[PDB]
């Protein structure tokens, strides 16, 4: 039994956004939505087996914010280059016409942890049947993130995952068709 | 380009044999570069870069803090393992296997954990290309093992007896 639990937290400027999430063998156990101040389990069945006081997460964050100002002054505010993500698209299962499926947009190896992702069906943004995951931690100092799209496979529809980040020259767009 | 400032901290609990040998690793990263570590095997703070030195100085001179820190292997790491060991460690999701030609393809999808073996068949060690293990990000994995041209066999911790074609 060789495993690895990871308490990942951070604070980012100037976006003024923080995060607190737990990680088991590379998969999210849960995180805390700071705004609503509550625990959000990656899978619903988890809630039965555990609990986490969200207050502690917000507490940590506040300290993170603090420390961040300390780290900025210590490095003369010395900025750093941004790291562009690598986007990939693929279905969750084999794709069968008329058989509901899920498109997975995978943003990886990027930092800072802040991006804008847009699902596109036939060139139009989709706001229905769209999910996403918080910024997940990698072995290294870079981040990871997933976006999901519920869809019915047809030969007429074509999809695009559009990812915008400060490391790119222009929004990135990975394509996907049933072809 | 645009300037950014990130305070990033990863508190890592490592288990080599369940609660047998546990190791705590606290990692602190400023921007894209790590600057400070606390390895339970060292028991002390160690700066990874120039930037992490001031902290190491300060914290290492806090006897009760280091003391509380060393204990956290148990008070935190162990404590959590006994909790997760109930649902996360023993999680088994049976894979779904499908064979089809685009070049024959063996689709092994929707399975956990990621430990899995997919073999083409006598067995063929030639003309085999796979996408590699793919994490779905929802506690499920998938992989495509393709044979250049029949039987596809799959072994997995969730399967007492192997699955075939």
């Amino acid at each position: 039994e060789e495993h690895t639990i990871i308490q990942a937290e951070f604070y980012l400027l100037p976006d003024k956004r923080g995060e607190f999430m737990f990680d088991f063998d590379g998969d999210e156990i849960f995180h805390v939505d700071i705004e609503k101040s509550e625990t959000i389990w990656r899978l619903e069945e988890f809630a039965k087996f555990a609990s986490f006081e969200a207050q502690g997460a917000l507490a940590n964050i506040a300290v993170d914010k603090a420390n961040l100002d300390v780290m900025k002054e210590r490095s003369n505010n010395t900025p750093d280059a941004n790291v562009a993500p690598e986007v990939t698209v693929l279905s969750r299962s084999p794709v069968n016409l008329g058989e509901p499926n899920i498109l997975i947009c995978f943003i990886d190896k990027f930092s800072p942890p802040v991006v804008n992702v847009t699902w596109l069906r036939n060139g139009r943004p989709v706001t229905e049947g769209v999910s996403e995951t918080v910024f997940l931690p990698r072995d290294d100092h870079l981040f990871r993130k997933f976006h999901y799209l519920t869809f019915l496979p047809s030969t007429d529809d074509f999809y695009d995952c559009e990812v915008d980040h400060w490391g790119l020259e222009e929004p990135l767009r990975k394509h996907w068709e049933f072809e | 380009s645009r300037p950014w400032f990130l305070e990033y901290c990863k508190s890592e609990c490592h288990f080599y044999n369940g609660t047998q040998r546990v190791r705590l690793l606290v990692r602190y990263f400023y921007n894209l570069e790590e600057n400070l570590r606390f390895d339970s095997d060292v028991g002390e703070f160690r700066a990874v870069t120039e930037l992490g030195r001031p902290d190491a100085e300060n914290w290492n001179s806090q006897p009760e803090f280091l003391e509380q820190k060393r204990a956290e292997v148990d008070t935190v790491c162990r404590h959590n393992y006994e909790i997760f060991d109930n649902f996360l460690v023993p999680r088994r999701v049976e894979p779904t296997v499908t064979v089809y030609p685009t070049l024959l393809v063996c689709s092994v999808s929707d399975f956990y954990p990621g430990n899995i073996e997919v073999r083409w068949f006598k067995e063929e060690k030639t003309g085999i290309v796979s996408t590699g293990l793919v994490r779905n990000g929802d506690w499920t994995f998938q992989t495509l093992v393709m044979l250049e041209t029949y039987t596809c066999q799959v072994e997995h911790p969730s399967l007492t007896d192997p699955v075939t074609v």
């Binding site: 997460a57 940590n60 300290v63 993170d64 420390n67 | 901290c9 606290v26 300060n58 803090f65 008070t75």
Partner: peptide, 13 residues
């Protein structure tokens, strides 16, 4: 539904 433990963020400076 046991409670999960976590490391309190240390103070810098």
């Amino acid at each position: 539904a046991d409670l999960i433990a976590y490391l309190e963020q240390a103070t810098k400076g």
